[PDB]
């Protein structure tokens, strides 16, 4: 399948409590492999997946320096953006950064992306062409002019289609036993009468990898997208994922409804019916 | 690996 490497950064100002909270996390697909936390004792980039452990001291020294540099940049940016929006010193504010690259099953570049946020809203985003920026407001428009002058776009693009995709390939090889595996979902169905004339039918998918999956309810053949309760794909905590979809069904008409399960790990798509 | 061409906003 296709794969992604993503870094997520959360910076939160703590007015009258000293330094802002800084949390950096690296993902290959939905697996966290590195962490930096300002409040942690180490003050190092730390491993969070077994396959990153085989990187030498130079890797950990370099990622520590560079994550600290991003921390320091965020510290400055919190001050500057507070200035741009003319906000008081007493209020807590959040900067969020996500950037990453996607490769196909052949390991080749598909796309790169970066989005920056202030207080849970779009601030500035790299455009699809990886050559220009979209600024959310006049504050971000000041940031855009600075990033244009610094040639930020050209340097970010070179990283996204160079270093990002190169190190994604390395990680995918080193951790292939987990990262490039496919575990099919173990499936079952539950039945919960809500009244004497209605019942919930819940379709379960457990222990599947990767996270991408399609749970679809159909009555007689017709898709029930509009009338399907669909929870977020959640982590089990053992390296696998879980999901369910539910339909409220008139009692004695359960046999009509069918749950379709599409997943990379399946030989053929599954079709499930109630007891 | 992290992006490292850091420009202040």
């Amino acid at each position: 399948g296709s794969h992604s490497m993503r870094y997520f950064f959360t910076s939160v100002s703590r007015p009258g409590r000293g330094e802002p909270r800084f949390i950096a996390v690296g993902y290959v697909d939905d697996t966290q492999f590195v962490r930096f936390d300002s409040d942690a004792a180490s003050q190092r980039m730390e491993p969070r997946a077994p396959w990153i452990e085989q990187e030498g001291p130079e890797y950990w020294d370099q990622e520590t320096r560079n994550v600290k540099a991003q921390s320091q940049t965020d510290r400055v940016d919190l001050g500057t953006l507070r200035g741009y929006y003319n906000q008081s010193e007493a209020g807590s504010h959040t900067i969020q950064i996500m950037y990453g690259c996607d490769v196909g099953s052949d390991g080749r570049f598909l796309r790169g992306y970066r989005q920056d946020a202030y207080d849970g809203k779009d601030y500035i985003a790299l455009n699809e062409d990886l050559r220009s920026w979209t600024a959310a407001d006049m504050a971000a428009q000041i940031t855009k002019r600075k990033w244009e002058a610094a040639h930020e776009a050209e340097q970010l693009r070179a990283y996204l289609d160079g270093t990002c995709v190169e190190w994604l390939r390395r990680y995918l090889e080193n951790g292939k036993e987990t990262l490039q595996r496919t575990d099919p979902p173990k499936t079952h169905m539950t039945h919960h009468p809500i009244s004497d004339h209605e019942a919930t039918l819940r379709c379960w998918a457990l222990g599947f990898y990767p996270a991408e999956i399609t749970l679809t309810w159909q009555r007689d053949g017709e898709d029930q997208t509009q009338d399907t309760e669909l929870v977020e794909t959640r982590p089990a905590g053992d390296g696998t994922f879980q999901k369910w979809a539910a339909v409220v069904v008139p009692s004695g008409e359960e046999q009509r409804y069918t749950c379709h399960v599409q997943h990379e790990g399946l030989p053929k798509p599954l079709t499930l019916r109630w007891e | 690996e992290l992006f490292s061409y850091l420009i202040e906003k």
Partner: T-cell receptor, first 114, second 110 residues
């Protein structure tokens, strides 16, 4: 004015304390302390990315800094050692990238004597 | 991730063109800088090459930048005794900040 660094020189007996002052009025968030031994390059001791934070450089041991204000980044030698005989350069920049380059002070020659 | 200058000392008869070598292992550099240092004195900026630039020229001074091979060469045309000084190569990146080579002591012999 740029970066003003005092004193320009100082002879100091082993175990005596000294503070090297460094001031800039350019509102630079970034300030740096380097040392340079004879026939060597500059080596970063300590840096500050703004008021209220300092961070260790390449050779921080035997040294202390502080940054209560944007203007000042003083370097303290608690107990002057023979190894601290060197020339010290303070510097500042508006950004990390410093496209106009660092602003350097004139330098401080410290000699540590028995 | 550091900066190196070989040779550490160069003796040249005046009028002769010469080269000073800089190599660095720093990645995603912001810029590379060449400094002049007279004995007992501070730093004088000669050239500052941005990441996006291949070279900078100032009179008899020309400096190249190859980010890929991690190299800069300072070309001094028609050298004069007044060129005699210590030449420091400095490379700036996010993780290491402005990082200095050991320098080359240039002696231009009259």
């Amino acid at each position: 004015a740029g970066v003003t660094q005092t004193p320009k020189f100082r002879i100091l007996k082993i175990g005596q304390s000294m503070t090297l002052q460094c001031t800039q009025d350019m509102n630079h968030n970034y300030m740096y302390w380097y040392r340079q031994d004879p026939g060597m390059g500059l080596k970063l001791i300590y840096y500050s990315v703004g008021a209220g934070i300092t961070d260790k450089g390449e050779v921080p041991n035997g040294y202390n800094v502080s940054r209560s204000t944007t203007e000042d980044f003083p370097l303290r030698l608690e107990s002057a050692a023979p190894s601290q005989t060197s020339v010290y350069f303070c510097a500042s920049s508006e950004t990390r990238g410093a496209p106009y380059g660092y602003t350097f002070g004139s330098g401080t020659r410290l000699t540590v004597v028995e | 991730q550091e900066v190196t200058q070989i040779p550490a000392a160069l003796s040249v008869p005046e009028g002769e063109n010469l080269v000073l070598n800089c190599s660095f292992t720093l990645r995603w550099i912001y810029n590379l800088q060449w400094f002049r240092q007279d004995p007992g004195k501070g730093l004088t900026s000669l050239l500052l090459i941005q990441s996006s630039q291949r070279e900078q020229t100032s009179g008899r001074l020309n400096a190249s930048l190859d980010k890929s091979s991690g190299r800069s060469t300072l070309y001094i045309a028609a050298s004069q005794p007044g060129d005699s000084a210590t030449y420091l190569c400095a490379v700036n990146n996010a993780g290491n900040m402005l990082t200095f080579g050991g320098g080359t002591r240039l002696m231009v012999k009259p």
